[PDB]
């Protein structure tokens, strides 16, 4: 900061930094909601299970990109554990990764789809592009 500047704003007039008036240190301000989150679901009335995609978050960072200490326990279940899967489009949690490719049911992105699939689970997989074939030229 400049020696007399008290806060900083970006091109959006979002106040992104502030000088602490007591210590004179500079604090960054981040939005509470930061980043995109999207919920995978089959229909309600087929399962209440869901999976969560943290659209640009790194799977070890999910417990901090989400403020998992401030969340309810029922959400914090979706912050960690088994069934984390680092896709592109960020970390997917709550769907088990499966090595069989299938036609795309729910399009998650960056090559990944998910489906409610055989108990049943939400499973995530890479799309099959098509049938493998060769021409005996």
């Amino acid at each position: 900061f400049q020696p007399f500047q008290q806060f900083g704003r970006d091109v959006s007039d979002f106040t992104d930094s502030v000088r602490d008036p007591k210590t004179l240190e500079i604090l960054d301000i981040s939005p509470c909601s930061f980043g995109g989150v999207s919920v995978i679901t089959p229909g309600t009335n087929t399962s209440s299970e869901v999976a969560v995609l943290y659209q640009d978050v790194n799977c070890t960072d999910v417990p901090t990109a989400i403020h998992a200490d401030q969340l309810t326990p029922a959400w914090r279940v979706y912050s960690t554990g088994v069934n984390v899967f680092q896709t592109q489009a960020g970390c997917l949690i709550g769907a088990e990764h499966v090595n069989a490719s299938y036609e795309c049911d729910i399009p998650i992105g960056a090559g990944i789809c998910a489906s409610y699939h055989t108990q049943k689970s939400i499973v995530a997989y890479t799309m099959s592009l098509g049938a493998e074939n060769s021409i005996a030229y």
Partner: protein, 436 residues
């Protein structure tokens, strides 16, 4: 002149590049985060504006899903992922530049590598990971301003390795199975014998390929090399794609900057009203920001719907050129590039497709005297195909698109009526192979 005709004595194989946009950035907006900026008080006021945010998110979700349809319906036209053949030269035609190269891990062709280098993305890619915006003072960035205001780009469903996998399959089938690839299960054909069939599709006799095949292959190879030399040195060929990138970047940048507007409130900064005014009278100021910001956001969604319809119209056209130019041979003039269409090869490009149109171009035309009909013995003979032509001493039939003079036999011609009716009839002899 009413009695002379120009026939091409030669031809050139031309390869022509057509660049088509197919998709745009799958933009997404957290409408509450944009308007009310995490403040709880404003969010209560935004509830009193009802369903506007839901309707805006629904619209942008339609745009996004449609971008995958556009990409799928262009590239995923072939259900069979015909793997790249081990040998890249067929009959002398060298496909090595448009097929993938196993010398690299990326399954792009060499041409596609140039295409993916020749366009620069405004973010260099969708990622700006969680920690990356909390940077130095110089590290302020319009992309971080976008994230802090709830604006994001979703990645496409098909990754570039998948688009390149489809184009590799399409060129592999085209290199090895011709038209049948579009009509059904791809049927193996020798490529020179496939090109011979495509010459008949022009109306050049099948021999003209085999009788010149080494020249034709050399011209094809050189033309593909001239594409590569242009795509390395050019700065403008993919402008139809870079300007789609630029337009969508600029639309988001103006949207975040529009948060700096006051819209007639005492301040552009929502915290600054809430800091400074009581709820009795802040709400009057907050409402001006809510309505103004919400108006700016609906402007963006409307123009995206406009731009998406334009891209979708372009994607439908690219999907038509894939079917008509790649999976077959098109009689539609200038549809599959200039010249008579022979073949097309699809190549992937960032948010687009590139068609290498291969066409026959007639060259070195020569003037000949010509006649509509021959009168042999009081009855008029017409060409079955082509035109009667005189080389100066002797009358022949030739095909129109390539000078190949043939003896005027009773096979090349059909007879109709006494030869008095046709104006410009001439008296040359018609040879009958039986009589000698």
């Amino acid at each position: 002149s009413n009695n002379t005709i120009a026939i091409p004595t030669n031809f050139s194989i031309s390869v022509t590049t057509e660049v088509m946009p197919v998709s745009m950035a799958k933009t997404s907006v957290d409408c509450t985060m944009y308007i009310c900026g995490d403040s709880t008080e404003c969010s209560n006021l935004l509830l009193q504006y009802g369903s506007f945010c839901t309707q805006l998110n629904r619209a942008l979700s339609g745009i996004a899903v449609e971008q995958d349809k556009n990409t799928r319906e262009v590239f995923a036209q072939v259900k069979q992922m015909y793997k790249t053949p081990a040998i890249k030269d067929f009959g002398g035609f060298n496909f090595s530049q448009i097929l993938p190269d196993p010398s690299k891990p990326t399954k792009r062709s060499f041409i596609e590598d140039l295409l993916f280098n020749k366009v620069t993305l405004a973010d260099a890619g969708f990622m700006k990971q969680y920690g990356e915006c909390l940077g130095d003072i110089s590290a302020r960035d319009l992309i971080c301003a976008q994230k802090f205001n709830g604006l994001t780009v979703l990645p496409p469903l098909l990754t570039d390795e998948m688009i390149a996998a489809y184009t590799a399959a399409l060129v592999s089938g085209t290199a090895t199975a011709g038209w049948t690839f579009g009509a059904g299960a791809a049927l193996q054909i020798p490529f020179a014998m496939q090109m011979a069939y495509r010459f008949n599709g022009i109306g050049v006799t099948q021999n003209v390929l085999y009788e010149n095949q080494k020249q034709i292959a050399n011209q094809f190879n050189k033309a593909i090399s001239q594409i590569q030399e242009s795509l390395t040195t050019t700065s403008t060929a993919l402008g139809k794609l870079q300007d789609v990138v630029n337009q969508n970047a600029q639309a988001l940048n103006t949207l975040v900057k529009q948060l700096s507007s006051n819209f007639g409130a005492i301040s552009s900064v929502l915290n600054d009203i809430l800091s400074r005014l009581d709820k009795v009278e802040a709400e009057v100021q907050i409402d001006r920001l809510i309505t103004g910001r919400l108006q700016s956001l609906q402007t963006y969604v409307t123009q995206q719907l406009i731009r998406a319809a334009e891209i979708r119209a372009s994607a439908n056209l690219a999907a038509t050129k894939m079917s008509e130019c790649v999976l077959g041979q098109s009689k539609r003039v200038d549809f599959c590039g200039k010249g008579y269409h022979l073949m097309s090869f699809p190549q992937a490009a960032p948010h687009g497709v590139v068609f290498l149109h291969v066409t026959y171009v007639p060259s070195q035309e020569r003037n000949f005297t010509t006649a509509p009909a021959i009168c042999h013995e009081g009855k008029a003979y017409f060409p079955r195909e082509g035109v009667f032509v005189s080389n100066g001493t002797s009358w022949f039939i030739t095909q129109r698109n390539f000078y190949s003079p043939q003896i005027i036999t009773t096979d090349n011609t059909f007879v109709s009526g006494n030869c008095d009716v046709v104006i410009g009839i001439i008296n040359n002899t018609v040879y009958d192979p039986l009589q000698p």
